[PDB]
Short mmCIF file of C-alpha atoms and ligand atoms in Angstrom, two decimals:
data_model
loop_
_atom_site.label_atom_id
_atom_site.label_comp_id
_atom_site.label_asym_id
_atom_site.label_seq_id
_atom_site.Cartn_x
_atom_site.Cartn_y
_atom_site.Cartn_z
CA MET A 1 10.97 -8.08 -7.81
CA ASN A 2 7.21 -8.24 -7.46
CA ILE A 3 4.31 -6.75 -5.54
CA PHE A 4 4.79 -8.95 -2.54
CA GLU A 5 8.48 -8.28 -2.11
CA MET A 6 7.93 -4.63 -2.91
CA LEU A 7 5.34 -4.12 -0.08
CA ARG A 8 7.34 -6.38 2.31
CA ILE A 9 10.12 -3.96 1.92
CA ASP A 10 8.06 -0.90 2.37
CA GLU A 11 5.94 -2.13 5.32
CA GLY A 12 8.37 -4.37 7.15
CA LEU A 13 7.18 -7.35 9.27
CA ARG A 14 6.20 -7.10 13.00
CA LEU A 15 4.67 -9.97 14.91
CA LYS A 16 3.34 -7.85 17.74
CA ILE A 17 0.73 -5.12 17.68
CA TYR A 18 2.46 -1.79 16.87
CA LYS A 19 1.42 1.67 15.87
CA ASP A 20 2.02 2.69 12.28
CA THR A 21 3.39 6.13 11.19
CA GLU A 22 -0.11 7.58 11.74
CA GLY A 23 -0.26 6.03 15.27
CA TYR A 24 -2.82 3.45 14.45
CA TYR A 25 -2.69 -0.07 15.67
CA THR A 26 -1.31 -2.42 13.06
CA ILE A 27 0.24 -5.83 12.80
CA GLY A 28 2.27 -8.00 10.41
CA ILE A 29 2.98 -6.59 7.01
CA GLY A 30 1.20 -3.36 7.37
CA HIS A 31 -2.22 -4.89 8.29
CA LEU A 32 -4.14 -2.00 9.92
CA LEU A 33 -6.26 -3.29 12.69
CA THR A 34 -8.02 -0.14 13.83
CA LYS A 35 -8.14 3.76 13.85
CA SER A 36 -9.24 3.50 17.48
CA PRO A 37 -6.95 4.43 20.35
CA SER A 38 -7.99 1.31 22.23
CA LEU A 39 -5.58 -1.43 22.47
CA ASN A 40 -8.29 -3.75 23.52
CA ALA A 41 -10.24 -2.82 20.56
CA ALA A 42 -7.18 -3.51 18.42
CA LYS A 43 -6.68 -6.84 20.15
CA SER A 44 -10.30 -7.61 19.46
CA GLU A 45 -9.93 -6.88 15.79
CA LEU A 46 -6.77 -8.96 15.70
CA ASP A 47 -8.47 -12.16 17.21
CA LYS A 48 -11.40 -11.80 14.89
CA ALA A 49 -9.07 -11.52 11.88
CA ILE A 50 -6.96 -14.51 12.88
CA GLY A 51 -9.59 -16.75 14.25
CA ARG A 52 -8.03 -17.33 17.70
CA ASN A 53 -7.12 -15.72 20.91
CA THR A 54 -3.87 -14.21 20.05
CA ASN A 55 -3.13 -12.05 22.97
CA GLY A 56 -1.73 -9.55 20.34
CA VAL A 57 0.96 -11.76 18.98
CA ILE A 58 0.82 -13.82 15.73
CA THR A 59 3.12 -16.12 13.88
CA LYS A 60 4.97 -15.43 10.60
CA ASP A 61 2.60 -17.61 8.68
CA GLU A 62 -0.45 -15.75 10.11
CA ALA A 63 1.15 -12.50 9.10
CA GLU A 64 1.83 -13.70 5.54
CA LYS A 65 -1.71 -14.97 5.44
CA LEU A 66 -3.18 -11.54 6.21
CA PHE A 67 -0.73 -10.01 3.67
CA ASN A 68 -1.95 -12.20 0.86
CA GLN A 69 -5.50 -11.37 1.67
CA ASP A 70 -4.68 -7.68 1.80
CA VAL A 71 -2.87 -7.67 -1.49
CA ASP A 72 -5.68 -9.64 -3.18
CA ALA A 73 -8.22 -7.16 -1.73
CA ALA A 74 -6.24 -4.24 -2.95
CA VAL A 75 -6.18 -5.46 -6.45
CA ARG A 76 -9.82 -6.35 -6.49
CA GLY A 77 -10.61 -2.89 -5.12
CA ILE A 78 -8.82 -1.30 -8.03
CA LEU A 79 -10.64 -3.45 -10.60
CA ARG A 80 -13.97 -2.70 -9.02
CA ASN A 81 -13.28 1.09 -8.97
CA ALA A 82 -14.36 3.10 -12.00
CA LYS A 83 -11.86 5.74 -11.48
CA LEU A 84 -9.08 3.29 -11.00
CA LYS A 85 -9.58 0.43 -13.33
CA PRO A 86 -8.94 2.26 -16.50
CA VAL A 87 -5.74 3.59 -15.24
CA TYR A 88 -4.64 0.27 -14.06
CA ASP A 89 -5.45 -1.52 -17.26
CA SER A 90 -3.52 1.23 -19.18
CA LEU A 91 -0.32 0.42 -17.35
CA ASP A 92 2.61 -1.98 -17.83
CA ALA A 93 3.24 -4.59 -15.07
CA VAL A 94 5.84 -2.57 -13.10
CA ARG A 95 3.71 0.64 -12.90
CA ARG A 96 0.70 -1.49 -11.96
CA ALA A 97 2.66 -2.62 -8.83
CA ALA A 98 3.24 1.02 -8.04
CA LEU A 99 -0.46 1.68 -8.05
CA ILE A 100 -1.24 -1.39 -5.96
CA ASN A 101 1.29 -0.13 -3.45
CA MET A 102 -0.46 3.20 -3.14
CA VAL A 103 -3.88 1.61 -2.68
CA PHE A 104 -2.57 -0.80 -0.10
CA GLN A 105 -1.15 2.12 1.87
CA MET A 106 -3.89 4.56 1.49
CA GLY A 107 -7.10 2.95 0.39
CA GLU A 108 -8.96 3.07 -2.89
CA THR A 109 -10.54 6.17 -1.90
CA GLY A 110 -7.43 8.01 -0.95
CA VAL A 111 -5.89 7.11 -4.24
CA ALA A 112 -8.89 7.85 -6.39
CA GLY A 113 -8.32 11.59 -5.20
CA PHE A 114 -4.99 11.73 -7.12
CA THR A 115 -7.14 12.49 -9.98
CA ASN A 116 -4.76 14.72 -11.73
CA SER A 117 -1.79 12.37 -11.31
CA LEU A 118 -4.05 9.59 -12.41
CA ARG A 119 -4.88 11.39 -15.65
CA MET A 120 -1.22 12.20 -16.56
CA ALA A 121 -0.31 8.62 -15.97
CA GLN A 122 -3.08 7.46 -18.16
CA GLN A 123 -1.54 9.72 -20.82
CA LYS A 124 1.91 8.23 -20.13
CA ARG A 125 3.28 11.71 -19.11
CA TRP A 126 5.60 10.10 -16.51
CA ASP A 127 7.59 13.10 -15.43
CA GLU A 128 4.63 15.25 -14.93
CA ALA A 129 2.80 12.60 -12.99
CA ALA A 130 5.84 12.26 -10.74
CA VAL A 131 5.84 15.84 -9.96
CA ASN A 132 2.16 15.96 -9.25
CA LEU A 133 2.24 12.90 -7.10
CA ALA A 134 4.82 14.61 -4.88
CA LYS A 135 2.55 17.54 -4.10
CA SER A 136 0.78 15.60 -1.49
CA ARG A 137 0.38 15.01 2.19
CA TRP A 138 1.49 11.43 1.35
CA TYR A 139 4.82 12.58 0.13
CA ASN A 140 5.39 15.01 2.94
CA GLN A 141 4.57 12.45 5.72
CA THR A 142 6.37 9.40 4.33
CA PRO A 143 8.83 10.88 1.79
CA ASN A 144 11.35 7.89 1.47
CA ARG A 145 8.63 5.44 0.67
CA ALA A 146 6.77 7.86 -1.42
CA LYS A 147 9.95 8.53 -3.42
CA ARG A 148 10.40 4.84 -4.07
CA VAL A 149 6.86 4.46 -5.29
CA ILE A 150 7.00 7.62 -7.38
CA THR A 151 10.26 6.61 -9.09
CA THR A 152 8.62 3.26 -9.91
CA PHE A 153 5.69 4.97 -11.50
CA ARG A 154 7.83 7.26 -13.36
CA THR A 155 10.32 4.87 -14.72
CA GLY A 156 8.50 1.62 -15.06
CA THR A 157 11.61 -0.15 -13.47
CA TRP A 158 12.52 -1.70 -9.95
CA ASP A 159 15.52 0.60 -9.55
CA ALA A 160 14.32 2.29 -6.39
CA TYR A 161 13.98 -1.06 -4.83
CA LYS A 162 17.56 -2.23 -5.39
CL1 LIG B 201 -9.09 -9.42 8.11
CL1 LIG B 202 8.80 6.67 4.30
#
């Protein structure tokens, strides 16, 4: 298990534009294209991202390409964030993947507002963090995923993903 396989499981893989759980246009392995309700807009963002006229359809390789970029960006976002970096560097490799997952799903910003959970984790108070993380819109809107991510953070193992 690793970050790539972990997110591939949580996000799935779709080669045609689709709407995510929030109703926004997305493609591939959870690559958000736009918050706009315009499909044309979304198609515009897709073509720009891929470098061709896709007509809203991409290949597997193109999808995996975007995924790599997205993961890399996520990580760099964490390291560049003052709120995040210290937590990240305090963690073991498994829990680090849990935090990348969250950023990938919700943005640096969104995650940096789990301040309290962030602090407990820094302190290695796993159970408490777990409970606090669950008191969130995140958990109530996508509970199965959120549970997987939260057990990961809490235990430091890949159990939820088996
Ligand atoms: Cl892009
Ligand atoms: Cl879910």
